[PDB]
Amino acid sequence: LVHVASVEKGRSYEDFQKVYNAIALKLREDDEYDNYIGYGPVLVRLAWHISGTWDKHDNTGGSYGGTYRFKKEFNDPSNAGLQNGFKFLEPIHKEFPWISSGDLFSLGGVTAVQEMQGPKIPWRCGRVDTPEDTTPDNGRLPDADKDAGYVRTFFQRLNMNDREVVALMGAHALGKTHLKNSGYEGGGANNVFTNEFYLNLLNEDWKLEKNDANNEQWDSKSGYMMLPTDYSLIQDPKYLSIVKEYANDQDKFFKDFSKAFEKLLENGITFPKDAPSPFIFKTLEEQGL
Numbered sequence: 001l002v003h004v005a006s007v008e009k010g011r012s013y014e015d016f017q018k019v020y021n022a023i024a025l026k027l028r029e030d031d032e033y034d035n036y037i038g039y040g041p042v043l044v045r046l047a048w049h050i051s052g053t054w055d056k057h058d059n060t061g062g063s064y065g066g067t068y069r070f071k072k073e074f075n076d077p078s079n080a081g082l083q084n085g086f087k088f089l090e091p092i093h094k095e096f097p098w099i100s101s102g103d104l105f106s107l108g109g110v111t112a113v114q115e116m117q118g119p120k121i122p123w124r125c126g127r128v129d130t131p132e133d134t135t136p137d138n139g140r141l142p143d144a145d146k147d148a149g150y151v152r153t154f155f156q157r158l159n160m161n162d163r164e165v166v167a168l169m170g171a172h173a174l175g176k177t178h179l180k181n182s183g184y185e186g187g188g189a190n191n192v193f194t195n196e197f198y199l200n201l202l203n204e205d206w207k208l209e210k211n212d213a214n215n216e217q218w219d220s221k222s223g224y225m226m227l228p229t230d231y232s233l234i235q236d237p238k239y240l241s242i243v244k245e246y247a248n249d250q251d252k253f254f255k256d257f258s259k260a261f262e263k264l265l266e267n268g269i270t271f272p273k274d275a276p277s278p279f280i281f282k283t284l285e286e287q288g289l
């Protein structure tokens with residue numbers, strides 16, 4: 001299976017900046033969502049979930065096909081709550097109906113990270129919608145109740161190494177867990193992209209507690225929470241080294257996150273040699289908008 005990127009006909013950087021802007025403006029406008037978290041965190045999670053179905057072995061899944069639009073994937077139990085991201089993006093897709101579904105979902109995540117003051121994430125267009133029968137089956141996204149060895153093995157399927165996994169998990173500073181979606185609850189209301197996941201892991205007093213869904217999670221009295229898979233990054237010595245690196249170097253985290261996230265969103269895609277270079281979108285702030 002080769003998935004060759006194909007630029008939406010006649011479109012260039014300025015087209016995609018407009019789409020970016022529309023998402024960014026809606027992020028600013030619809031600020032009440034999820035107890036004033038806003039939609040930034042769920043859009044990042046959406047971009048990851050649409051990409052994280054990829055399997056390096058056969059090139060199935062991945063962002064290219066935009067298959068989250070189909071019911072099998074839309075209704076994956078692992079994707080519970082992402083319907084809110086999809087609804088957010090509906091009027092954007094109405095305004096810009098030429099963009100492919102994969103490009104929109106992935107661009108949503110890029111826009112969210114940047115608008116939340118995260119690193120710039122270079123982004124390439126050209127994902128092409130594929131048919132319903134290309135939708136990957138449920139069960140390719142990771143479980144949260146597991147340990148470091150699970151996390152490490154899981155992410156080999158996505159061709160991610162230890163550094164990539166640890167960098168990517170820093171997105172867990174964002175938003176919160178919701179008992180009705182995942183069987184985990186809490187984490188506060190953060191919508192600023194920082195390296196605080198690593199700082200919190202290292203510096204908080206964590207207790208292993210059961211939540212109201214009868215699942216174990218790690219909680220601190222300050223109101224922070226970590227999944228078992230998050231906490232595994234400080235249980236495993238190789239992950240721990242990396243957690244400490246990012247806790248001590250915000251810029252390095254930003255740079256590594258940006259690379260890993262771009263890679264995640266592009267796994268499975270063949271870019272022709274004469275494809276445009278990745279785009280780096282300006283934030284609303286940078287544009288004076």
Ligand code: HEM
Binds near residue numbers: 048143175176183
């Ligand atoms: C072992 C890997 C991972 C596991 C088990 C995991 C699990 C979860 C779970 C259970 C939630 C709560 C969902 C809810 O209840 O609404 C969640 C939220 C989130 N995850 Fe992950 N995740 C993982 C990796 C990632 C990666 C790689 C990213 C992005 C780079 C990501 C970004 C997020 C974001 C942004 C949220 C918050 C969404 C919201 O506030 O609505 N996670 N994650």
Ligand SMILES: Nc1cccc2nccn12
Binds near residue numbers: 188
């Ligand atoms: N631990 C965790 C996982 C996913 C999202 C999130 N937000 C705050 C904490 N958190």
